[PDB]
Amino acid sequence: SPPAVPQTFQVAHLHAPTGSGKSTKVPAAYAAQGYKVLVLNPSVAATLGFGAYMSKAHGIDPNIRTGVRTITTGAPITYSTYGKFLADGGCSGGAYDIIICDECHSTDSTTILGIGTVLDQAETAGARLVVLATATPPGSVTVPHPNIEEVALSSTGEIPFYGKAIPIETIKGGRHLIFCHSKKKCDELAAKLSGLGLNAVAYYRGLDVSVIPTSGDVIVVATDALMTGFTGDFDSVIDCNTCVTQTVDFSLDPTFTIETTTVPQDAVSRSQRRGRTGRGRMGIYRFVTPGERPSGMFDSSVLCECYDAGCAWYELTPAETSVRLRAYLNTPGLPVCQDHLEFWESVFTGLTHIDAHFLSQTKQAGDNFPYLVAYQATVCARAQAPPPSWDQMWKCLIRLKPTLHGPTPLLYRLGAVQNEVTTTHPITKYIMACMSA
DNA sequence: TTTTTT
Ligand SMILES: Nc1ncnc2c1ncn2[C@@H]1O[C@H](COP(=O)(O)OP(=O)(O)O)[C@@H](O)[C@H]1O
Ligand code: BEF
Ligand SMILES: [Mn+2]
């Protein structure tokens, strides 16, 4: 099944169910043939996990690259997160024969930028093959999994869960993964469970992967941070079936609005989340709501997210980001989106001389669109004006509060606006212009 | 994801 290594560069797809071996068996096979393989995965947890597993199951200690830990062994297989790959500077000259863009169903901006980088540098780097692997391609619909029995939750149970309940005997003893749409819910549920005498831990972006025990009874409560790649050896997965997403609204008031909303999971999410169990053995998947929305396309806001990440984390200029996103959108078989590259590139191109201290603060705070948030703050500081509001999002300006006055020079909307507003700032006029033509 | 001196 795995694509054969051609004589000249070629991009191929690899589609197989969750747990089939795409991220482990396949690269092992390629390595056995004498090829140097690089596997890019969006999950730090899974990446670190591949190192241990491959070591004691495939008799191979691969190189590991993540922002948390690096392991260089010199093996013919390297596992790296897209993030670390971008941070390292992309493809290295003549380093690998095959590059596997693993879990290519992921629509987070880091994965998009990472895959686009590969599609644009691979051939020049000397790679002869690029593989786009996923158990859930664009137009895919959730299909029955041989190892996973799906059981709906009911109103019976001593643990409230998104309108339904979870019976304690369903998670008492054994290993279980519970998906919650938000970090706050994860903390609350874990606490609720711990209080009942169960071994429960929360996990989401920001916490150490070590919080999840390798063995022994445990109930992990997580966000989509454990949706893909990861094998936690769970006997079951309980899914709230909801997720948090973002949408861009060109509301011209004065420019655009990026609204975050909680909605039902799409087909990719349902299959990937379900697939965290039933990996190399039988498992159970319990759900709150059946069905799901179609997959295959993402919002223009994700493109905005890519430019933002490029500027804030990967030292990529807007033009550089465009080159990479074009490669991604010009390759068939991947998630599609409106072609708003010109628009978004022009938007970020005008955002110069951001206050580094603010950028640093929004990145560490883990805010969405840290560059846009920090840039709005930068403009407020320079105009000696207050932020749109005084919610956590704008705390980086508290130190200047006593000096801030007048209306806020609104560049765009990222949340609720309480203070008066002015739309005459050069940047606001520029963005409005970008939206015109 | 990516990410801390003297
Ligand atoms: N970290 C791990 N710990 C234990 N088993 C693992 C681990 N990773 C993979 N496996 C085993 O190998 C199989 C294939 O895993 P993997 O390659 O990640 O699947 P996928 O096809 O979803 O990419 C799993 O079903 C499981 O039995
Ligand atoms: F499809 Be597997 F869960 F990476
Ligand atoms: Mn995988």
**3-class DSSP state of A289:** coil
Which nucleotide is nearest to A313 if distance is taken from CA to C1'? Answer: B2
* Residue A107 CB lies within 7 Å of the nucleic strand B: no
- Measured CA A352 to C1' B5 distance, in angstroms: 26
User: CA nearest A48: which of A308, A177, A229, A265?
Assistant: A229
Ligand 2 pocket mutation, candidates A1, A13, A15, A23, criterion most atoms within 8 A of CB: A23
CB atoms within 10 A of CB A126: 15
Spatial distance between the Cα atoms of A180 and A225, rounded to a whole number of angstroms = 10
- Looking at the structure, do residues A304 and A432 belong to the same domain, yes or no? yes
Give yes or no: residues A108 and A160 share one domain.
no
Q: Note whether A324 and A116 are within 8 A (CB).
A: yes
Domain closes at, from A138, A170, A194:
A138
Question: Going along A55-135, which residue ranges are E strands?
Answer: 63-65, 70-71, 77-81, 98-101, 129-134
Domain CATH for A91: 3.40.50.300
The total of other beta-carbon atoms located within 10 Å of residue A250's CB is 13
Number of domains in chain A: 3
CA distance A16 to A399: 53
Helix or strand run (H / E) with residue A28: helix A25-32
**For residue A156, how far is the Cα from the chain centroid?**
34
Give me A87's structure tokens.
């941070």
Q: Does A308 share its domain with A322?
A: yes
Q: How far is the CA of A199 from the C1' of B4 (A)?
A: 33
CA-wise closest residue to A375 among A411, A406, A330, A408: A411
CA→C1' distance for A357 and B5 (Å): 16
Alpha helices in A58-195 (DSSP H): 82-88, 109-121, 183-195
- The Cα A83–Cα A313 span in angstroms is 9
Say whether both A17 and A42 belong to one domain. yes
Which tokens go with A362? 């929004």
Nucleotide nearest to A82 (CA to C1'): B1
**Do A143 and A238 belong to one domain?**
yes
Provide DSSP, A224-274: GGGSSS----BSEEEE--EEEEEEEE---SSS-EEEEEEEE-BHHHHHHHH
A111 touches strand B (CB under 7 A): yes
Half-sphere exposure of A352 (CA within 13 A, CB side): 6
- Taking the C-alpha atoms of residue A303 and residue A364, their distance in angstroms, rounded to an integer, is 21
Strand B proximal to A300 Cβ, under 7 A: no
Strand partners, A277: A234
Q: List bases in chain B with any atom under 7 Å of a protein Cβ.
A: 1-4
CATH number of the domain encompassing residue A404: 1.10.820.10
Of A104, A123, A138, the residue at which a domain comes to its end is: A138
* Contact of A236 with A171, CB cutoff 8 Å: yes
Pocket test for ligand 2, best of A50, A224, A272, A285 (most atoms within 8 A of CB): A272
| Residue located via tokens 């790959």 | A85
Q: Which residues contact A104 (CB under 8 A, 6 or more apart)?
A: A111, A115, A132, A133, A134, A334
| A232/A206 same-domain check | yes
Q: A436: domain range? A: 243-263+296-437
Residue type, A386: P
**CA distances from residue A123 to A99, A119, A194 in whole angstroms, order as listed:** 10, 8, 51
State the structure-solving technique.
X-ray
- Do A249 and A305 contact (CB within 8 A), yes or no? no
Task: In whole angstroms, give the CA distance from residue A91 to residue A93.
Answer: 7
CA dihedral A47, A48, A52, A54 (to 10 degrees): 10
Task: Check if A135 has its Cβ closer than 6 Å to any atom of ligand 2.
Answer: yes
Distance CA A173, CA A310 (A): 44
The residues with which A421 forms a beta bridge, in sequence order, are A408
Contact by Cβ (8 Å): A58, A30: no
DSSP structure string for A314-370: S---HHHHHHHHHHHHTSTTS-B----HHHHHHHHHT--S--HHHHHHHHHHT-SSH
Å separating the CA of residue A361 from the C1' of nucleotide B4: 12
Please check whether residue A387 is in contact with residue A376, taking contact to mean a CB–CB distance below 8 angstroms. Answer: yes
Residue A23 in contact with ligand 2 by CB distance below 6 A: yes
Residues A22 and A160 in one domain: no
A318 sits within 7 Å of strand B by its CB? no
CA A179/CA A202 separation, integer angstroms: 10
Residue A207's Cβ-count burial label (10 Å; 0-12, 13-18, 19+) is middle
Would you call A195 exposed, middle or buried from its count of C-beta atoms within 10 A (0-12, 13-18, 19+)? exposed
User: In degrees to the nearest 10, what's the CA dihedral of A409, A414, A420, A422?
Assistant: 30
A143 and A255 part of one domain: no
| For ligand 2, mutation pick of A13, A14, A22 (most atoms within 8 Å of CB) | A22
A294's CB contacts (< 8 A; 6+ apart) are A139, A141, A266, A267
Tokens of A371: 């560059």
Can you tell me the distance from the alpha carbon of A410 to that of A428, in angstroms, rounded to the nearest whole number?
Answer: 7
Q: Are A133 and A26 in contact (CB under 8 A)?
A: yes
Token reading at A283: 């498992």
In chain A, positions 181-210 with C-beta closer than 7 Å to nucleic chain B are: 205-206
**Final residue belonging to a domain, choices A87, A103, A138:** A138
Q: A93 and A184 in one domain?
A: no
* H or E element in which residue A200 lies: strand A200-203
Resolution reading in Å:
2.0
For residues A136 and A223, what is the distance between their CA atoms, to the nearest angstrom? 19
Based on the domain organization, do A225 and A254 belong to the same domain? no
Distance of C1' in B6 from CA in A312, Å: 25
- DSSP string covering A417-437: --S-EE--SHHHHHHHHHTT-
Cα dihedral across residues A311, A316, A318, A324: positive or negative: negative
Taking every pair of C-alpha atoms in chain A, what is the biggest distance, in angstroms? 68
Counting ligands in written order, which one lies closest to the CA of residue A275? 2
Asked if A273 and A259 sit in the same domain, the reply is no
Whether A77 and A162 share a structural domain: no
Cis peptide before A254 (omega within 30 of 0): yes
